Write an enzyme that holds these catalytic residues in place. Structure first.
Site, short mmCIF file in Angstrom:
data_model
loop_
_atom_site.label_atom_id
_atom_site.label_comp_id
_atom_site.label_asym_id
_atom_site.label_seq_id
_atom_site.Cartn_x
_atom_site.Cartn_y
_atom_site.Cartn_z
N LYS A 162 0.86 -1.19 0.00
CA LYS A 162 0.02 0.13 0.08
C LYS A 162 0.88 1.18 -0.04
O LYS A 162 1.62 1.63 0.95
CB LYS A 162 -1.11 -0.08 1.19
N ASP A 190 -0.31 -0.19 -4.61
CA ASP A 190 -1.80 0.20 -4.59
C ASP A 190 -1.85 1.67 -3.92
O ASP A 190 -1.41 1.46 -2.70
CB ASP A 190 -2.56 -0.81 -3.77
N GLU A 216 -2.23 0.03 -8.59
CA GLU A 216 -3.69 -0.09 -8.53
C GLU A 216 -4.12 1.51 -8.20
O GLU A 216 -3.49 2.15 -7.29
CB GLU A 216 -4.25 -0.83 -7.28
N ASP A 241 -9.03 0.32 -9.84
CA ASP A 241 -9.86 -0.20 -8.81
C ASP A 241 -11.09 0.53 -8.73
O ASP A 241 -11.99 0.47 -9.26
CB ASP A 241 -9.15 -0.45 -7.56
N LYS A 265 -14.25 -6.28 -7.77
CA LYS A 265 -14.51 -6.55 -6.61
C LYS A 265 -16.29 -6.86 -6.71
O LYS A 265 -16.89 -5.90 -7.17
CB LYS A 265 -14.53 -5.49 -5.60
MG LIG Z 1 -7.35 -1.77 -4.78
#
Ligand SMILES: [Mg+2]
Length: 368
Positions: A162, A190, A216, A241, A265
């Site tokens: 992240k 991401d 991402e 995303d 997702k």
């Molecule tokens: Mg993501």
């Protein structure tokens, strides 16, 4: 088969370590569980994991909107998935997260009725290995490196990092990680909308040396129109995303060549029905897809895993968060093997439910 009652549960489970992304910090997976009952006595399960800063929903809102939805579904046929998805949309706009839970449960019922595991019911097959990454929360660079090490030690072969801080700090983060874990372990990053268009491009060319698999959502979801510019200036592939929620979003991103890949997702696409459309689009555009999620339990990710088997264009997997729970309340479902390989249930339906009397301890409401 007629829907006779639906139950909703607030399911808060604490994480071992707090989960940290550029958008904020979470100490719990505050999820909402959905159980649909048919007259024939079949039960479908669905789960959702509201993320306030992305879904715009919370466990509290989900628990209420869910009741609106339940009311509308009572008396309908659980097999009319499209008709019922539409019925929910007619009741309330958006609220995909909670919607997905109902949608997942409906498919559970449907697959049960057909006597197939979900993946087979969706036309998929077990012709590939599903391998999850594991996520390093965004922190001070030494902490992050330490976590990366522990993750490699545990056997995981893909690391998700992240980022989304300042240009200087993100580069230091990636370096200290590559420095402390090697160059052979595959890693993906991401930003969760963390950078400006400028910082994104500077940081992404500054990171190319460290061999990163894809990035991402580098910038604000409102700035998706600047994605094509970033894609062309940067060697690292970029994955949409937040910018890719439903099929309209997908089509639009493709139309302007905004990104190299999608992160799919179920909660963003309001269930499986629309996730399938996104997959088809990504197929027609030869775009690799990563299936992921939020803080769903193994039940939620079991739905993701089933969907993951539906198309060969899907080839990346982010199914890690259930491993961060203090306690696993799920019965059945996907099982994590070594190297982060995931096995999908073969029994009829979703192939997962909740442990005995775990649910009875939860705050619940019962529609009809
Ligand atoms: Mg993501």
């Amino acid at each position: 088969m007629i829907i006779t009652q639906v139950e909703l549960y607030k399911s808060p489970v604490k994480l071992k370590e707090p989960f940290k992304i550029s958008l904020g910090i979470l100490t719990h997976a505050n999820n909402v569980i959905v159980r649909i009952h048919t007259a024939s006595g079949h039960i479908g399960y669905g789960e959702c994991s509201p993320f306030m800063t992305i879904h715009g929903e919370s466990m509290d809102t989900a628990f209420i909107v869910g009741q609106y939805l339940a009311k509308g579904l009572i008396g309908t046929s659980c097999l009319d998935i499209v008709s019922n998805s539409l019925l929910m949309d007619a009741i309330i706009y958006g609220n995909s997260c909670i919607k997905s839970a109902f949608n997942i449960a409906l498919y559970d019922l449907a697959a049960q009725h057909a006597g197939l595991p979900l993946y087979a019911f969706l036309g998929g097959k077990k012709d590939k290995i599903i391998q999850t990454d594991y996520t390093v929360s965004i922190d001070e660079p030494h902490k992050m490196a330490a976590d990366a090490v522990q993750i490699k030690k545990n056997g995981f072969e893909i690391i998700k990092v992240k980022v989304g801080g300042s240009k200087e700090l993100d580069v230091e983060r990636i370096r200290m990680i590559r420095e402390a874990a090697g160059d052979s372990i595959t890693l993906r990053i991401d930003a969760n909308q963390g950078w400006s268009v400028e910082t994104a491009i500077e940081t992404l060319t500054l990171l190319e040396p460290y061999n990163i698999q894809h990035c991402e959502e580098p910038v604000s979801r409102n700035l998706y129109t600047a994605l094509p510019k970033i894609r062309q200036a940067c060697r690292i592939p970029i994955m949409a995303d937040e910018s890719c929620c439903n099929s309209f979003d997908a089509e639009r991103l493709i139309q302007i060549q905004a990104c190299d890949s999608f992160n799919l997702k179920l909660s963003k696409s309001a269930g499986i029905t629309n996730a399938l459309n996104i997959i088809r689009l990504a197929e027609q555009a030869h775009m690799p897809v990563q299936v992921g999620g939020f803080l769903e339990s193994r039940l939620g990710f079991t739905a993701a895993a089933h969907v993951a088997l539906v198309s060969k264009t899907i080839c990346y997997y982010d199914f890690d968060t259930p491993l961060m729970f203090e306690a696993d309340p799920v019965r059945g479902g996907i099982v994590y093997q070594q190297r982060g390989i995931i096995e999908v249930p073969e029994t009829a339906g979703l192939g997962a439910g909740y442990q005995k009397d775990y649910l009875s301890g939860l705050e619940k409401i019962c529609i009809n």
